[PDB]
């Protein structure tokens, strides 16, 4: 369940009294009683007034944040902390635009642990005006991920192992080193 019941002490942008006829607005019981009916119907007008904020990941309630993750495939499994999810959903759509690139592995790793990693790979980009030059990238493929964690509890290696598993482009091996 969610317990989205009525909220005490909330006003409305559409008072029932303000729509009543004239002369009618002179009574004591009518004004007080019909104001009571506003209490039950008050919070419905709140969500209609503020619906744009109900979709922004940075502010929307926790329940929708997981739901919002499914809209853009945020890989929200395994996180039991609300603030960790807040960044992932908003930043998810930016990663997929560069998924698999140089910054793709770094940022995703940085996103999951908060610290920028050090990576060395077998690749590069160079130009030579000489006709038919070489491409000195590296002789054999190799991917390495290094993390400078301050408190290396011996579970980060598996977490880095799992995380970098879906980051690599299914083409090259890898190894995980954590401070």
């Amino acid at each position: 369940a969610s317990q989205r019941g009525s909220v005490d002490g909330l006003g409305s942008s559409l008072p029932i009294a303000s729509m009543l006829p004239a002369v009618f607005a002179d009574d004591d019981l009518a004004l007080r009683f019909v104001a009571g009916l506003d209490d039950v119907l008050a919070p419905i007008l709140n969500v209609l007034d503020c619906l744009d904020t109900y979709f922004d990941p940075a502010l929307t309630p926790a329940d929708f944040a997981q739901w919002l993750g499914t809209w853009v495939g945020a890989e929200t499994d395994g996180t039991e902390a609300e603030p960790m999810l807040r960044a992932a959903v908003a930043a998810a759509a930016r990663l997929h635009r560069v998924r698999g690139t140089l910054q793709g592995l770094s940022e995703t790793v940085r996103l999951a642990f908060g610290v920028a990693p050090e990576i060395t790979e077998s690749g590069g980009a160079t130009w030579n005006a000489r006709p038919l030059g070489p491409f000195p990238g590296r002789p054999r493929p190799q991917l390495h991920v290094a993390l400078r964690l301050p408190e290396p509890r011996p579970v980060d290696v598996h977490r880095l192992d799992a995380l970098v598993a879906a980051a690599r482009p299914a083409h090259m091996p890898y190894t995980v080193e954590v401070t």
Partner: protein, 639 residues
């Protein structure tokens, strides 16, 4: 996911929090307090997030997959050497039995083909490595010579003459013979028949006939492949026809008293031409183009069927018509390209839009047709569906009897025919086009793009292969075709190996959107059979017969390749086989008191070999268990 948590019964009655009316159930004012209209509002309010999802999906630009049309190959037999013309008009819908509960899936003849009433030309006989060097003229009527020299030489051939060759039909050449001495069995004679073409020699199929060849007088109904052309052969213009002869071939019967040749006559029974489950709409104009960019146009037939020339739009250039390309998205267009996009699931055509840039100027993606030019659509195709896949080709209105030709035959079941995806299905497709963005790169993408390339496969999981000699490792994809319990329980095997189509199809779609310069591999996982023999003592007031029946199958259900395990789905591709996890299965079986011991043997489906008795089994990561027949001893005081 829930905006509200109220209902009709949820009435707060907070008037006492302001007023003093103090009746819980008054005669009247409680009725006024009763407001179902909130319930009829909150129920409509709860669905608002769903509506926003669909509306916002359109912004990403994702659409619905158009349905695909099933295609079949059909052949118009004639059972006569005549009818030098196309036989049956294009169309002539055929369907199944028009039962009132299931609607017959209609069809439509698509193409047409013309055959020739050719006559047999020369008749020759030769063996492997030796030229014809025979009569080559009189064998048409007389001068009988033993066929193939009555010997199964590797490479024996026989050329046959056919004036005015037929590039595309099914052949039937009569070579009468006097059969005596030994009768070779009609099942699988050791010969290979080929016909000449522009490229060369290809295998020609053979249809039903009443004689097994050289065992009784009769012809052979070859299937002439496409590309067959004519050449010079003595005094006739004969399309070259070859008849390879193989050895006894591991015991296949062969003769030494081969019958000779008696006469000759050609029959050219029928031709081949495919058909699809989709009607055609010819030359339907859309309207007059305007000079404005970004126009939209509609059609009069909603579910347009997919295909590379999906619509084939034409604009009125000064030279007849100028054709238009089709692109899934416009981002790849150019300032002077000719690109159209089509929302085929609702028959909408949209030209190139115009987008303002940061400079404030315009960047027109895709050229716009000139103002006042005629816009016309060449043709569409509507139809297709899941039911479009016929079974066994048994159309049953396949025109068994026609006054014009003898019979029209459709044997091979049709393929394709993917139904249009449901809107609910699209919501489960939105992340994939937003995460992968096509052009599969990482490990997860191959797990998903395989499903999109071929959803009919039961399940796919991708795994990196063994490392190469240059330091990389080619990608490997595992395929498990959908299985049906053909035998009496467990599985029959040979269904878990795909039929060279899923291997080709799945890889083909992936290869275009694959990492450049990296090898891609597909196949099935490793398999090994395990039989669980044990001994379980039944209770003192139970029927061991049912216990005997229950113990065997309940033990088996745990090792199911497709739906085994505790979860009830396919195995996790690497879970080891173990007795304690089976020990969990045994203990819960009804009618048991205690269990003595369990013994497991590795095995393979190729033979009946049983491996060494062991408890723990090391199962490789890209592999799956095979559940086999097993028996356990049920010794106990049963009733």
């Amino acid at each position: 996911q829930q905006f509200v948590d109220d209902a009709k019964r949820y009435i707060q009655q907070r008037a006492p929090e302001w007023t003093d009316h103090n009746v819980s159930d008054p005669g009247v004012t409680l009725v006024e307090t009763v407001a179902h209209m909130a319930d009829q509002i909150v129920y409509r309010l709860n669905r608002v997030p769903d509506k926003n999802h669909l509306a916002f999906l359109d912004l990403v630009g994702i659409t619905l997959f158009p349905p695909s049309a099933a295609r079949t190959d059909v052949t118009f037999w004639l059972s006569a050497p005549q009818e030098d013309a196309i036989l049956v008009p294009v169309g002539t819908e055929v369907a199944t039995l028009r039962t009132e509960r299931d609607e017959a899936v209609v069809f439509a003849t698509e193409q047409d083909l013309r055959i020739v009433p050719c006559t047999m030309g020369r008749l020759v006989t030769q063996v492997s490595g030796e030229a014809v060097s025979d009569r080559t003229t009189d064998l048409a009527e007389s001068k009988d010579v033993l066929c193939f020299a009555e010997a199964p030489n590797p490479g024996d051939c026989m050329l046959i003459g056919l004036s005015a060759a037929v590039p595309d039909c099914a052949l039937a050449l009569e070579l009468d013979s006097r059969v005596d001495g030994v009768g070779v069995d009609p099942r699988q004679p050791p010969l290979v028949w080929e016909a000449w073409t522009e490229d060369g020699w290809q295998s020609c199929e053979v249809d039903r006939d009443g004689t097994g060849g050289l065992n009784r007088p009769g012809d052979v109904v070859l299937h002439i492949p496409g590309g067959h052309v004519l050449s010079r052969n003595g005094g006739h213009e004969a399309g070259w026809i070859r008849c390879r002869v193989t050895e006894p071939l591991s015991g296949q019967p062969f003769y030494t008293t081969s019958p000779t040749i008696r006469s000759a006559e050609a029959y050219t029974i029928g031709g081949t031409t495919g058909s699809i489950h989709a009607e055609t709409v010819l030359d339907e104009p859309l309207g007059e183009s305007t000079g404005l960019p970004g126009q939209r146009l509609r059609l009069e037939h909603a579910p347009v069927v997919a295909g590379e020339p999906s619509v084939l739009l034409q604009t009125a250039a000064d030279d007849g018509w100028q054709d238009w390309q089709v692109v899934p998205h416009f981002s790849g267009s150019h300032p002077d390209d000719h690109h159209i996009t089509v929302d085929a699931t609702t028959g909408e055509i949209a030209f190139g839009p115009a987008v303002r840039e940061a400079d404030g100027t315009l960047r027109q993606y895709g050229a716009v047709p000139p103002k006042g030019a005629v816009i016309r659509a060449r043709r569409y195709r509507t139809g297709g569906g899941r039911a479009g896949n016929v079974a066994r080709g048994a159309v049953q209105v396949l025109r068994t009897s026609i006054p014009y030709v003898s019979e029209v035959v459709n044997r091979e079941a049709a393929l394709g025919g993917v139904d249009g995806e449901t809107i609910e299905e699209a919501k489960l497709r939105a992340p994939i086009t937003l995460r992968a963005q096509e052009r599969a790169v990482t490990l997860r993408d191959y797990e998903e793009l395989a499903r999109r390339a071929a959803p009919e496969t039961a399940r796919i999981t991708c795994l990196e292969g063994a490392e190469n000699e240059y330091g990389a490792h080619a990608v490997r994809v595992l395929v498990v075709p959908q299985a049906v319990p053909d035998p009496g329980g467990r599985l029959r095997f040979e269904q878990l190996v795909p039929g060279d189509a899923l291997l080709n199809r799945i890889t083909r779609h992936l290869d275009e959107r694959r990492l450049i310069g990296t090898r891609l591999a597909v196949g099935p996982p490793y398999y090994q059979g395990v039989t669980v023999v044990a001994t379980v003592h039944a209770f003192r007031d139970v029927d061991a017969d049912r216990v005997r029946r229950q113990t065997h199958d309940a033990l088996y259900r745990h090792l199911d390749p497709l739906t085994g395990g505790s979860d009830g789905k396919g195995w996790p591709f690497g879970r080891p086989v173990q007795t304690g996890e089976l020990f969990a299965v045994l203990q819960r079986v009804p009618g048991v008191e205690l269990v003595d011991e369990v013994v497991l043997h590795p095995a393979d489906p190729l033979t009946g070999k049983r491996g060494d008795p062991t408890n723990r089994i090391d199962l490789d990561a890209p592999a799956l268990v095979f559940s086999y027949d097993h028996r356990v001893r049920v010794i106990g005081d049963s009733a």
